[PDB]
């Protein structure tokens, strides 16, 4: 499912039994200015479960501080690094440190109507 | 499923049998400035259905007015008041009155691959 | 599933075999100034598959350029044209040409608790 590309990568974890998906962590330091966005690297290479797709989903605590998720639809049987688009829609600079929890990866089945 | 914590709370409703989820209503009054966000309280405590999570989803009419949803991933078998992060990305202030329909809560089952 | 209302409409495509949903295309020319949003017409009418709802989901390519999705919850047995709210949170004017891929429509079955 998940492979570490570097020793900076942290394995995606589940916060709770009833967690919708997997916690994602930044592998690098970032500084996002207000009204700007940054693609954050996890350094986790992922293999999409067959007949499923992924959605990068917001942390509530970050959303309360103005930080939103851009994009995050992971499909087409994607194999590669997990990137997270953090959008700073707050008034102040937002700092990301290596190892910070940044988002959740939620799996759902592809529906074929 | 839904417990009104105060007399200001309104029971979440499915308006049509084809609705994805349950209409949520503000339990309080708010005035959201342009470029700002606010956690809107519903005063509704929810019991999560087993192996499910909830997503706060936008009203289309509000999205056309520049109002978006922040956060809104309700998981971890969450027990407590439903809050909706309303983001005003319009040019003018957005008024939220008690009783206003603010969002929809959509349930999905958790997929643990 | 999909019906063209005009000669300008382009039929939604499932890209890869592991695509989450169907690519949507603009039927018209649009100019979106920074900090503004626009409802983009596809001129494609849809009939909702039984016990399902739709979600307009972002293209990663546009999200990385600062283009986000507003609204996009298609429920309540929806019959009619598909429109996509594109939000220009970039710093320059965003151009939408006829035939441009603008988003994806992702179907999910409604969970009834
Ligand atoms: Cl943490
Ligand atoms: Cl979403």
SS (H, E, C) A86-109: EEECCCCCEEECCCCEEEEEEEEE
How many residues in total does chain C contain? 113
HEC string of chain A?
CEEECCCCCCCCECCCCCCCCEEEECCCCEEECCCEEEEEEEEEEEECCCCEEEEEECCHHHHCCCEEEECCEECCCCEEEEEEEEEECCCCCEEECCCCEEEEEEEEECCCC
Q: Give the method used.
A: X-ray
Distance CA A45, CA B83 (A): 34
Give the count of beta carbons closer than 10 Å to the beta carbon of residue A17. 10
Q: What is the distance of C-alpha C93 from the center of its chain? A: 20
CATH code for the part of the protein at A1-113: 2.70.40.10
- CA-closest candidate to residue C81, choices C38, C33, C24, C31: C24
Matching residue, tokens 């007949």 = A51
DSSP E strands: which ranges in chain B?
2-4, 22-25, 30-32, 36-47, 52-57, 67-70, 73-74, 79-88, 94-96, 101-109
For residue B36, which of B98, B86, B95, B82 has the smallest C-alpha distance?
Answer: B86
Provide the resolution (angstroms). 2.2
B100: left (phi over 0), alpha (psi -120 to 50) or beta: beta
* B48 Cβ neighbours under 8 A, 6+ residues apart: A18, B54, B74, B75, B77, B78, B79
Neighbours of C57 (CB within 10 A): 21
Does an H or E element contain C31, and which? strand C30-32
For residue B67, the SS3 value is strand
Which one, of B82, B89, B80, lies nearest residue B62 by Cα?
Answer: B89
Per DSSP, B13 falls in state B
Distance B46 CA to ligand 1 centre (A): 24
CB pairs B-C closer than 8 Å:
57
For residue B49, the 8-state DSSP code is: P
CB atoms within 10 A of CB A92: 10
Report the alpha-carbon distance of residue B80 to residue A32 in Å, rounded.
Answer: 32
Sheet of C73-74, strand order = C22-25, C101-109, C52-57, C73-74
Tell me, in angstroms, the distance from the centre of ligand 1 to residue B104's CA.
Answer: 28
Phi then psi dihedrals of residue C64, to 5 deg: -70, -20
Q: Under a CB-based contact definition with an 8 Å cutoff, are residues B86 and B25 in contact?
A: no
Where does residue A31 rank: exposed (0-12), middle (13-18), buried (19+ CB within 10 A)? exposed
B69 neighbors B32 (Cβ within 8 angstroms) = no
Instruction: Spell out the alpha helix ranges (H) of B27-77.
Output: 60-63
DSSP C28: S
Residue of B nearest to A51 (CA): B113
Q: Give me the residue spans of the domains in chain B.
A: 1-113
Mark yes or no for CB contact C104/A76 under 8 Å. no
């Amino acid at each position: 499912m998940f492979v570490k590309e570097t020793n900076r990568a942290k394995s995606p974890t589940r916060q709770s039994p009833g967690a919708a998906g997997y916690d994602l962590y930044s592998a690098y330091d970032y500084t996002i200015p207000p009204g700007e966005r940054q693609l954050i690297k996890t350094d986790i290479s992922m293999s999409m479960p067959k007949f499923c797709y992924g959605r990068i989903a917001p942390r509530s605590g970050l959303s309360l501080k103005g930080i939103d998720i851009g994009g995050g639809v992971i499909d087409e049987d994607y194999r590669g690094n997990i990137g997270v688009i953090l959008i700073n829609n707050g008034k102040c600079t937002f700092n990301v440190n290596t190892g910070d929890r940044i988002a959740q990866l939620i799996y759902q089945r592809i529906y074929y109507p």
